User: Which sequence fits this backbone?
């Protein structure tokens, strides 16, 4: 203008959106235990 | 305006803290998945017993 001020206004672009925070419950695997060696007792079945 | 910027930083801190609590509950050993497994296995054992 006569003072040096613009006629066509400036751009005001859209800022970045707030994101959604993400996590994860990652999982592992330990196997089952190997069954041991059986030992014959000296007592009968009700006692042992 | 600077007070409002500090308020937004406070709210983003609260968002990260809520996500930290959520990730703790997902990643803890006594989470809901352990209780799902635990009651399903114990339900099978309980019916057979």
Assistant:
């Amino acid at each position: 203008t006569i003072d040096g001020q613009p006629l066509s206004l400036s751009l005001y672009a859209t800022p970045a959106d707030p994101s959604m925070l993400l996590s994860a419950a990652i999982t592992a695997s330990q196997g089952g235990g190997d069954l041991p060696h059986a030992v014959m007792p000296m007592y009968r079945f009700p006692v042992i | 305006r600077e007070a409002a910027v500090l308020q937004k930083n406070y709210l983003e801190t609260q968002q990260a803290q809520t996500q930290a609590q959520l990730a703790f509950l997902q990643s803890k050993f006594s989470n809901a998945a352990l209780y799902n497994w635990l009651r399903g296995r114990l339900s099978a054992i309980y019916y057979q017993f």
User: Anything to note?
Assistant: Chain A touches chain B at residues 18, 21, 23-25, 27 (CB under 8 Å). Chain A has no helices and no strands. The radius of gyration of chain A is 39 Å.
